[PDB]
Write a protein that binds this DNA or RNA. Structure first.
Ligand SMILES: [Mg+2]
Ligand SMILES: [Mg+2]
Ligand SMILES: [Mg+2]
Ligand SMILES: [Mg+2]
Ligand SMILES: [Mg+2]
Ligand SMILES: [Mg+2]
Ligand SMILES: [Mg+2]
Ligand SMILES: [Mg+2]
Ligand SMILES: [Mg+2]
Ligand SMILES: [Mg+2]
Ligand SMILES: [Mg+2]
Ligand SMILES: [Mg+2]
Ligand SMILES: [Mg+2]
Ligand SMILES: [Mg+2]
Ligand SMILES: [Mg+2]
Ligand SMILES: [Mg+2]
Ligand SMILES: [Mg+2]
Ligand SMILES: [Mg+2]
Ligand SMILES: [Mg+2]
Ligand SMILES: [Mg+2]
Ligand SMILES: [Mg+2]
Ligand SMILES: [Mg+2]
Ligand SMILES: [Mg+2]
Ligand SMILES: [Mg+2]
Ligand SMILES: [Mg+2]
Ligand SMILES: [Mg+2]
Ligand SMILES: [Mg+2]
Ligand SMILES: [Mg+2]
Ligand SMILES: [Mg+2]
Ligand SMILES: [Mg+2]
Ligand SMILES: [Mg+2]
Ligand SMILES: [Mg+2]
Ligand SMILES: [Mg+2]
Ligand SMILES: [Mg+2]
Ligand SMILES: [Mg+2]
Ligand SMILES: [Mg+2]
Ligand SMILES: [Zn+2]
Lengths: 24, 98, 78, 127, 60, 206
RNA sequence: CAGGCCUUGACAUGCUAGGGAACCCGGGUGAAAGCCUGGGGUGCCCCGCGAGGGGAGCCCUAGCACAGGUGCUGCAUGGCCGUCGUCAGCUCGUGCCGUGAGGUGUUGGGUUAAGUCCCGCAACGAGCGCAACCCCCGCCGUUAGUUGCCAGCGGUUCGGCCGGGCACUCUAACGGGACUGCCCGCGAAAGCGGGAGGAAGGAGGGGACGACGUCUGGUCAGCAUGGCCCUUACGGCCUGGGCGACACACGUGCUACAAUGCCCACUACAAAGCGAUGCCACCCGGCAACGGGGAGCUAAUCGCAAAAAGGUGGGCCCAGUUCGGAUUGGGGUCUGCAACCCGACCCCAUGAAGCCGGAAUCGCUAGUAAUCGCGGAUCAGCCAUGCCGCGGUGAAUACG
């Protein structure tokens, strides 16, 4: 859910990028 | 070749001051590209009417920054006299390049 | 969190290092609850400020990578 | 030769072109049924041709830009009509009767201050 | 203590961190702008007079 | 409390910016502050003239500083030795080559910003307020006009109970844009408090 | 708030006095503030070979007059904002009735969103409101073309990239359009219901606009301001603490309790804004946050940038689970002098309550509700799930 940092959504919602949502 | 910018605020003036720089840019030789109206950048900002606590019914304004472009094809020594010395911008601003 | 420095204020070590001279007494006050604990600074009980007074806090290896602040309670009724 | 109609519908501008022939349909550089794969509303944009009856006749070449895929399908459904309405002074009998002409003025409205969503008003305590 | 502040704010010698804003007209620290240099209160005020160039009662 | 500011309202059309020029985000807060401290000084040492506006224009280093007034007698000076010292002042802070135009008032009884000040004065001078209004109003019609409305705040007459004085004649379509209504506000610093005055001069229609 | 310090003061104005007078570089003690102290010597007005002597700004000391106070009073006030409510209302001039307070007008008949209009009438008119005058989305058009397009023929290293073109699209500036002028039905009128043409009717749909007054409404802490009160402190600086406390109650919120679902790889369609020690392409380092290099941009011509939901196929299998991410441990990064109180991200490990919520109660009539992603202000950083905006997908129902 929009509340799990270790998730695509979570990361997205948080407005961040990372290992679960890298910059391409 | 020479490019010219036209910012300012009241699009009522800027339009004229610009348009002038064509009816007078053709008489000085080379042809020109009609006053081209590029997009407008806007400055909107909201404020809470009351001077205290009333997050509702507040009020926001705008600050329309009109821009306008136009350009002469060939740089005549003729035109130069006009442009360079015909500085008549009430509240206008102009940038020139190549 | 500091990985290139240690932000540990100088008027500390300064007063700790000069004290390092053969190692004498210890009673030493400060308001740097914001600095870090330096290794070997054990035995040097440093009364820390909290806004009210200076807590006569001992200091030992167990506690090091910490701030003298963690050791000072800011509020009351813990 | 070229048969164009201005496709526009809710922040969606579609460019419609009609070339007699097969029936192939293109949009922004792709096969119609491919650029809209999944959308069961795709086959809806071509519905105008299906009542003029004249489908196996115009290799339509479109290019819609701006908006949402579905919105685009709307822009298109208007171009395919506005385009062919031109090259058929009699095909007016459908763009007016079979309601195929309206920009749908229907569009998102400004979010008023003090209304989470331009209308949805915040909660309420009272107590 | 709002006088000594406006001045204290002007001075800057200490750590750029503490360099903070404050309304130009009224000694107000809250809701200022990186543009105008006015506070919501002030801004809207001038705004209504016209002393704010190109600024217009927004409409869309 | 509501009612918009007939100025900022009309702003767009009818009434134009009391300060008109341009500048980018880099420097704009500056040319405003300036434009402000300018008017700031002018409203001070020049009041004895009763100025009802201070347009200001620019371009680059140049400054309009145009001052409208009703009694220029004190603007220029004796033969011309007053304004001369003012250009100095305006420059004494403005590191620019500021000019300084000036005009008059074809009738102060049609210059709200004045009707106000005039009234604002009377009160401050213990005059009777009802009259000072019922009167200051007529004075605006007698001198040709279509709209005049004056308003005074509370404390009228040192009354511990702050009231409010209303008074107007003719028509005043405050909501109508094709109105061209001059709006003016003046203070009053009576030993027993403070007063406020609203001036509404509905002039030419359309 | 505790503690360490300063007094014509952190700032305005004026005056008196020997010195020195502009300014720049330090040192000592200290937590900082502060206090104490050691070093070059000056364009100016001018008698004058010169030394030197008088001296106008500005500054330092001393003293005098004064500053300053978010201290009290929003029932002493200005200003501005909130509310009844954009509700259809409130009044005025004169005439007339009435002992008078006050009526009439503005009661009545039809109509309307409307004190909108009409017709009536001891009333005849009028003003502030209503409407209209203003901006936006709409239809179409003219001017203008470095956005745009095999649109047309074109060369093209195979991208509107190059030549080249205003036709599209678009950008932005000026216009036409819609006015109950047509037809039928009802009527004394105003005007109601029906219908065609039209992009749009009978105010076309949203903005801006909120009467006399009301709540002794709100705010003296934005500002202004009368009165009151403080002056080596009710003023001023500083370091540290606090506003972030927590057995608890409420308000508004966010994430959820799952297969109309969640996860993972791939692949699309936006709008609106924003950017100079600023947004970062593109590289190399790292699992990553981010870091070393470094192109372009004064920004319809580079960047923020990726829209997300969607579409494809792949994995879970009804389990407190691959549902849900609280809690905490360990390892890090960035802004900043400085993250103990007290920042935001990252990664590993922890995986809490929750399987749809009592009594109650809220929002919403259509591009609305619901749902998904995006921009901006403030701003070093950020506790923003807030607010103010943008667009994508896109309903249910209205007997009464
Ligand atoms: Mg999960
Ligand atoms: Mg939406
Ligand atoms: Mg509320
Ligand atoms: Mg204090
Ligand atoms: Mg800060
Ligand atoms: Mg007295
Ligand atoms: Mg002093
Ligand atoms: Mg008040
Ligand atoms: Mg009281
Ligand atoms: Mg009467
Ligand atoms: Mg009588
Ligand atoms: Mg009467
Ligand atoms: Mg009326
Ligand atoms: Mg009839
Ligand atoms: Mg309208
Ligand atoms: Mg009260
Ligand atoms: Mg005050
Ligand atoms: Mg502190
Ligand atoms: Mg704190
Ligand atoms: Mg708080
Ligand atoms: Mg806390
Ligand atoms: Mg794409
Ligand atoms: Mg945006
Ligand atoms: Mg943009
Ligand atoms: Mg590479
Ligand atoms: Mg770098
Ligand atoms: Mg770099
Ligand atoms: Mg966690
Ligand atoms: Mg439920
Ligand atoms: Mg139940
Ligand atoms: Mg019940
Ligand atoms: Mg509704
Ligand atoms: Mg956001
Ligand atoms: Mg920020
Ligand atoms: Mg937090
Ligand atoms: Mg919030
Ligand atoms: Zn302010």
């Amino acid at each position: 859910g929009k509340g799990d940092r270790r998730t695509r959504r979570g990361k997205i919602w948080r407005g961040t990028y990372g290992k679960y949502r890298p910059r391409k | 070749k020479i490019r010219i910018k036209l910012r300012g605020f009241d699009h009522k003036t800027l339009d004229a001051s610009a348009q002038k720089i064509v009816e007078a840019a053709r008489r000085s030789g080379a042809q020109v590209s009609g006053p081209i109206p590029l997009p407008t950048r806007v400055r909107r900002f909201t404020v809470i009417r009351g001077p205290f606590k009333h997050k509702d019914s507040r009020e926001h304004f705008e600050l329309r920054t009109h821009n306008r472009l136009v350009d002469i094809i060939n740089p005549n020594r003729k035109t130069i006299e006009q442009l360079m010395t015909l500085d008549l911008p009430t509240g206008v601003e102009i940038e020139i390049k190549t | 969190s500091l990985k290139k420095g240690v932000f540990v204020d100088d008027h500390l070590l300064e007063k700790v290092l000069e004290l390092n001279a053969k190692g004498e007494k210890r009673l030493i006050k400060t308001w740097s609850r914001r600095s870090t604990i330096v290794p070997e600074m054990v035995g040097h009980t440093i009364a820390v400020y909290n806004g009210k007074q200076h807590v006569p806090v001992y200091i030992t290896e167990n506690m090091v990578g910490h701030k003298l602040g963690e050791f000072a309670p800011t509020r009351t009724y813990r | 030769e070229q048969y164009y109609g201005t496709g526009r519908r809710k922040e969606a501008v579609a460019r419609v072109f009609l070339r007699p022939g097969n029936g192939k349909v293109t949009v922004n550089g792709q096969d119609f049924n491919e650029y809209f794969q999944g959308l069961v509303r795709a086959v809806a944009a071509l519905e105008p041709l299906r009542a003029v009856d004249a489908l196996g006749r115009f290799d339509a070449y479109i290019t819609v830009r701006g908006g949402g895929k579905s919105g685009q399908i709307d822009a298109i459904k208007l171009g395919i009509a506005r385009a062919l309405v031109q090259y058929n002074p009699d095909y007016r009998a459908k763009l007016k009767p079979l309601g195929f002409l309206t920009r749908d003025a229907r569009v998102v409205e400004r979010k008023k201050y003090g209304k989470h969503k331009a209308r949805r008003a915040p909660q309420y305590s009272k107590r | 203590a709002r006088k000594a502040l406006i001045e204290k704010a002007k001075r800057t010698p200490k750590f750029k961190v503490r360099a903070y804003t404050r309304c130009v007209r009224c000694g107000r620290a809250r809701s200022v702008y990186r543009f105008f240099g006015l506070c919501r209160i002030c801004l809207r005020e001038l705004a209504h007079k016209g002393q704010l160039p190109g600024v217009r009662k927004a409409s869309w | 409390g509501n009612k918009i500011h007939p100025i900022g309202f009309r702003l767009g059309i009818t009434r134009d910016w009391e300060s008109r020029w341009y500048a980018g985000k880099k420097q704009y807060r500056h040319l405003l502050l300036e434009d402000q401290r300018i008017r700031g000084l002018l409203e001070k040492e020049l009041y004895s003239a009763g100025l009802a506006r201070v347009d200001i224009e620019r371009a680059a280093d140049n400054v309009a500083v145009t001052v409208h007034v009703a009694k220029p007698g004190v603007v220029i000076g004796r033969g011309g030795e007053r304004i001369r010292v003012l250009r100095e002042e305006l420059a004494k802070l403005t590191g620019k080559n500021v000019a300084l135009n000036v005009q008059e008032v074809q009738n102060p009884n049609l210059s709200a910003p004045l009707v106000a000040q005039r009234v604002a004065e009377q009160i401050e001078r213990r005059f009777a307020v009802r009259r000072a209004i019922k009167q200051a109003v007529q004075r605006v019609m007698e001198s040709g006009a279509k709209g005049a409305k004056v308003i005074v705040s509370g404390r009228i007459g040192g009354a511990e109970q702050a009231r409010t004085e209303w008074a107007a004649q003719g028509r005043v379509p405050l909501h109508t844009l094709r109105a061209n209504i001059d709006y003016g506000f003046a203070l009053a610093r009576t030993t027993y408090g403070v007063l406020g005055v609203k001036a509404y001069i509905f002039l030419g229609e359309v």
